[PDB]
Amino acid sequence: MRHRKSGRQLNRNSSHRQAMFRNMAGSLVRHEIIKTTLPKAKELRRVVEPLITLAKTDSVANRRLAFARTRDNEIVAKLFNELGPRFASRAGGYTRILKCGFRAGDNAPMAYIELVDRSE
Amino acid sequence: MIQEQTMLNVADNSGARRVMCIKVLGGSHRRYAGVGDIIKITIKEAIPRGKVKKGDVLKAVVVRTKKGVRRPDGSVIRFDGNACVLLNNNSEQPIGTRIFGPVTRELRSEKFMKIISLAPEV
Amino acid sequence: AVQQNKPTRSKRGMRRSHDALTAVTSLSVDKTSGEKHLRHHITADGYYRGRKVIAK
RNA sequence: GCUCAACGGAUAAAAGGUACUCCGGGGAUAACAGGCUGAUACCGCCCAAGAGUUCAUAUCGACGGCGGUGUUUGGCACCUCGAUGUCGGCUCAUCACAUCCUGGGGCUGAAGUAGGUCCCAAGGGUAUGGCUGUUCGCCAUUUAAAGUGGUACGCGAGCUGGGUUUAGAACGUCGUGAGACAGUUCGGUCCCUAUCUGCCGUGGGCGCUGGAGAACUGAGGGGGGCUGCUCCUAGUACGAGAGGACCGGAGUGGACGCAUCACUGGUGUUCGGGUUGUCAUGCCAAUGGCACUGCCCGGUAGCUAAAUGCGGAAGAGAUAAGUGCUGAAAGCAUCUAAGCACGAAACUUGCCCCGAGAUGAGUUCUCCCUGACCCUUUAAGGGUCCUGAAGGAACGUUGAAGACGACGACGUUGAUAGGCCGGGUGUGUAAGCGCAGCGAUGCGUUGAGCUAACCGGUACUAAUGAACCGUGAGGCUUAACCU
RNA sequence: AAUUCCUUGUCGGGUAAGUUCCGACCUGCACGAAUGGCGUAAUGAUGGCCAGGCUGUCUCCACCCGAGACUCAGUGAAAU
RNA sequence: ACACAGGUGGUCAGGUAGAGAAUACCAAGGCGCUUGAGAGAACUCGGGUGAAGGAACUAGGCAAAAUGGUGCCGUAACUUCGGGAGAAGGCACGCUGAUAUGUAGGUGAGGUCCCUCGCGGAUGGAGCUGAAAUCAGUCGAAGAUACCAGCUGGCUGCAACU
RNA sequence: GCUCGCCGGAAGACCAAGGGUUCCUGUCCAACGUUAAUCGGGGCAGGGUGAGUCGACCCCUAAGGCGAGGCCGAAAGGCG
RNA sequence: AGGACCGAACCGACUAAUGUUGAAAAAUUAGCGGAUGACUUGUGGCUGGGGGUGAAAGGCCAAUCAAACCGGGAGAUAGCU
C-alpha cells in the first residue's frame, strides 16, 4: 500500500535521518570506507554521489553549494580541485557496496560502503 | 449545501430576511438540497401585509447555492448567498407577486415552471 | 477467558515444525581462489567474486 | 399463691436501628431470564338478538360457545447464593406470518376514479425530530409499508452514566427516634494482553498415481430480483352527468449493491514561493537548525465523495391457492377415480462469479528422460558409480501484490530498482548582472530558477558463471480385435 | 415551588413540536414568618432556558505525520 | 522493594524576544534517557489540514476550534454610588531616508568663570543613551505576522461576596 | 576526535537533612548489571576528606522537657 | 488603601487526554478557581485509643477507624463450613 511512497523508512525520525545522512556522506570523502548496515548504505548513494557530481559543473557561482543541502565544512576546500575535473565527469557509480552478512552474534545486516579511487 | 438549521433569505416578496430549513424529505436518507430540490421551511419574520404568517410550515425550492446547476452540459453555473422560492403545496406555482435576484430557467418541473413567465430577464 | 488445560507435547511439535529461519542452503564459488561463500555475501575472511576484499 | 397465657413453668426483672455494619452460613430464602401453565391475553371462527332505507352474513355485531398461539396480566419454584451487571439509546440484523408495501383470486350497498374488505404465498421492500433517561405515551412533519410479533420481552470480556443507586445534602410528608418514600432536586466510580469451538484472510505438509507446462468441462453454491410522485399511452374504457382508469413507457426522486478518478472541491510533512522570532555561517548579501510542517499560500503523483457511472432480460423447462378439459364411482353432477392441459412478483436452465479433496479427485493439448554394479540372517534392505531432461525454486533488482508468507515484473539474450540527461504538470521570474532610485525597491536579460511520483532516451552503478532441487519411458486386474 | 395527588396542571409568550424556559391562575390534598418571611447589586469550581458569535460535536468523514501493534534477533513475567 | 516519570528544604543567575520567576530560540556549563536492525498493516494512543452547511451532535456547546497584542476612539440596562466595564462595537499596525549623517526627556564633558585648589563651587550643553512627531517614498494575497495571548448579549431559581 | 541533536530559571552551578564508601584510578569480567561490555554505587587492591575565625563543645534561651525540698496517687507514675 | 481584577511561584483539584497484571497499589499530560489573605510554608514542641482533634464528613490519628498496632489472658465462644 503506502499510496505512492517509494523511499524506504529505515530507523529513527525523518529529522535524525536527515542529519545522519548529511554527516555520513560528508565524512565518507575523508574516511574512504565506512562500516554500517545494508538498508542504510543502499540509500547513501542517493546523497553521496550527487555531492561528488556537484564538482562536475565549473563556476564561481557553484562554490556556494553544499551549504543548504548535504553541508560539510572541509570538502568545500578540496573536492572542486580533486574530483571535479576528471572523476565527477562520470556523473555517478562512484560507490561500491560490500554485503558482509552478520556483524557478530546479533541480527543486523552488516555492510561496508566505499568510494572508487581509480577509474581505469 | 443547504441543510438542517440553515438560516437564509427568501426570493419571493413579503417573506423577510430570515427563514429556517427544517429537513429535506421526499424519500429515504434525505440530506442536503440542490437547485430545484424541494425542502421543508419555517417562516420567522414575514411582513404583516403578506399572505403567510410566523411558525406556519411550508415547502420551498433552492434557487441559489454554490454547488450551482450542471444538468445542461456538465459545466457548473453557481450562485452567491443561499436562497429559496416558496411553493404552494395544493394549487402549485410560487406564492409572491415579485421575485428577487437574476434567477435561472433550469427550474422546469410543471409545479414551478411559471418562474420563467415573470418580470426577470430569464 | 484463560488457559484451562495445558497444550500437549504434540502441539509443541506442531508449532516447531517450521522453526528453521535458515536451513542452511548451498554456497557459491569464487573466481581466483579455491574458496566458497554465502549467496550474494562476502565471507568474514574477505572472499567474493575473485576480489578478496576488506580481509583481516 | 402469677393471662409466669410465648400456657412443658428460659431472669424476680428487658424495646428498637444498621445506607458505617462485621463475622458463620444460604436458592434451606428473594427480583430478572429458560422451561412448565394458558385462567388472563392476542388472533380467527360457531351461534346471529339487532344495525345496514328494504335486507342478518356488501360491511358489522349482542346474549353465549369453541379452536389456534406462547403472547401480554398472573402463577409453580425444576437450572442462580464459589454472581447469566440494572431501563431506554447507538451499533447490528435475523427469523416468523394471524401479509404491512409488492403479487394471485374475489364480494361489494364495485356503474367509472377512489373507497369498504376476505382468502393464498416469506422472493424483494417498510420515518425523523421536540420536552422527556426514557423506547414508549403526547406532538410536529413525512411513507409504497412507517404492519402485527419472536430473538436472555434480541444492547457492557461492545459503548455512554441519563433512568436505577448507596456514602455529602435539601424540599415536602410520615415515623417519639436512630430512618424512611420504585416521592422530589443538585451531586456522586464503568476492570479485562484471549486456550478452544465460532469466524476472516493467509503459508507449509499430504492426496489426485512417470515428471513437467497450461487451458477446458461442471457435481453443486452465491449474486441479480422493490418502488413513491407526475406526464404520455387516454377525455380512450365507464357513467344522466360531474369526473376519470388498465397493458407498456418516459420525466424526476429514493432505498440497496457494485465500479471508477475523466469531472470538481478537499488533502497532498519526498515539489515551489512568501514571512515572524532566534541561534549559526567573522559581518553583510544569501542559506540552514529549532520554534504545532513555527506561520502563510499554491499544488504534481495518488487517495476521496463533499464527485461521476450503473441494475433486477428474452428463449427453453417445471411449480401451492387459483384457471381446468373429457369423465366414472353416485344415469345426473363433478378438476380425479382411469386419462390429459393452463399458471405467480416465486423457481431450474439461460447471464455474472466461485467450483474436480466432485477421494465419484473428469478432459485435452504443448514439453522431456530410453542406466549399471557389490553385499545380506534378502521375495526385502543397506552401499557405490554413470547420467540428470523438460521444469521449479533459492539467491538477487523489487512491485501494479502485502502485517508475515504467497504472488505480478526484470537478472546483462537486461528498462526490474537507483542514477544521469531532458520533457511535462506544479510553482512563479530567483541567487547574479545591467540600469533607475536617498533607499526600501522596480524593470530588462527572464515564461527565470527549482522538482517527486507523470512521460522519453540511457545500461551510467547494481541484479556472476554456476551451485541447488527435479532422474533414466514410469503399479495391479480384465475384455475384444488383428497376430 | 427542589414542596403538587388528577399534574408531563390550565392559559398567554418563546419551538416545526417543549415531561423543560418566562409570566399569569388559586383549588398551597402538605410554602409561611429566626425552626425565619419577602427583596435587590458586584460576585459565585451553581441547577434550568432564549438569541447571536465561533466551531469536524454533527451532515460524512477524507487525506497527511509519529509511537505501540507487525518481522527477525537480544536478555526474558502473570492469573490459570 | 526495581539503574521506579512518585516524595523531598536552603543557595546563585545571562543573551535576544517578554510587564514577568510565563514562554520561544540560545550562551556558559551539562547531557544523548545502559537492547538492536527493518517493514510501512487494520487497529489503539498522540499529532497535522480540511470544502459547503452549523449544534442539526448529545441528557446537555461536553469536547474542540475561533478570538487573543498595543495605541486612539466608543460604551447599555441594572445599581446598595462602590460596581456593571474588557460593556457592546470601531480605526490602525512592515520597511525605507530626511529634518537632526540622533530632535526632545534621562545622563553629561573638553571649556568658561569663582573661591577657603578640592570626595569643591557654579555654568554652558559636545560625548553617551535616545522617544515621539512631521514630510516623502516602497513591498507581500497576508505586517500583532512566529511563540505568548478574551466568547458575547438577555431571563430565572439558589447562594450576600472572600 | 569530529559533526548533529536535547536541557539551558536546567537536564547548569553551590549546599543541608538523610545515606555511610557510594568519591579518585589500577585490574578482572568467572557471578551481578531485562543489549555488547574492554564500562558500572559489581569481583579485587590501593588512595582519600587536615580549621583559633563554618558548626558543635563553649556562652544564652522561646515553646517545651527533665524537676531537690514540698505536694498528688495503693505502688509504678504524675504536679511543680 | 484594599478578607479587589489579569496572572507565575505558592495553595487547591472543576475538568478532559492517557493509565487500569500501570512507568506509578492514588501517577502522568494539557486546561482551570485562590493568589497579601479568615494567605502559604520549613523547623522544634505538646495532645493517645472509647482517648485526642475537626469553619463538621461519622472526617483525621503509620493503607484499617460504629474506634490504628503489639505481648498476654488464649488453644476465648461457634446448634456452623
DSSP assigned state of C14: H
CB of C39 within 8 Å of any CB in chain A?
Answer: no
Q: Which of B36, B44, B52 is nearest to B96 (CA)?
A: B52
Diameter over CA atoms, chain B = 43
A79 exposure class (CB count in 10 Å sphere: 0-12, 13-18, 19+): buried
**In which residue are the cell numbers 449545501 written?**
B1
DSSP assigned state of A42: H
Expressed as residue numbers, the domain containing C43 is 1-55
Q: What proportions of chain A, in percent to the nearest 5, are helix, strand and coil?
A: 35, 15, 50
Sort out which chain C residues have CB atoms less than 8 A from A112's CB and list them. 54
Protein residues closer than 7 Å by CB to strand E:
A 3, 5, 9, 13-14, 105-107; B 1, 3-5, 7, 20, 22-23, 29, 31-32, 42, 44, 54-55, 57; C 2-4, 21
State the first-to-last Cα distance of chain B, in angstroms, to the nearest integer. Answer: 24
The structure was resolved to a resolution in Å of: 12.0
Domain count within chain C: 1
| Spacing of B79 CA from G16 C1' in Å | 78
CA distance A50 to A24: 14
Taking residue A20's Cβ as centre, other Cβ atoms within 10 Å add up to 15
Give the DSSP letter string of B40-58.
EEEESS--TTSS--TT-EE
Taking residue C13's Cβ as centre, other Cβ atoms within 10 Å add up to 10
| Spacing of B55 CA from E5 C1' in Å | 36
Diameter over CA atoms, chain A = 52
Q: How many CA atoms lie within 13 A of B113 on its CB side?
A: 4
**8 Å CB contact of A100 and C40:** no
A94 within 8 A of A56, measured Cβ to Cβ: no
Residue C5's nearest nucleotide, by CA–C1', is: D195
Question: Which of C41, C43, C56 is the best residue to mutate to test the A interface, defined by the most A CB atoms within 10 Å of its own CB?
Answer: C41
Q: Report H helices in chain B.
A: none
**8 Å CB contact of A98 and C42:** yes
Please name the amino acid found at residue B72: P
Taking residue B13's Cβ as centre, other Cβ atoms within 10 Å add up to 16
CA distance B91 to C8: 83
Q: Report H helices in chain A.
A: 14-31, 38-42, 45-53, 79-82
| Spacing of B50 CA from D9 C1' in Å | 102
Q: Could you tell me which chain A residue has the CA closest to the CA of C40? A: A99
If DSSP codes are grouped into helix, strand and coil, which group holds residue A26? helix
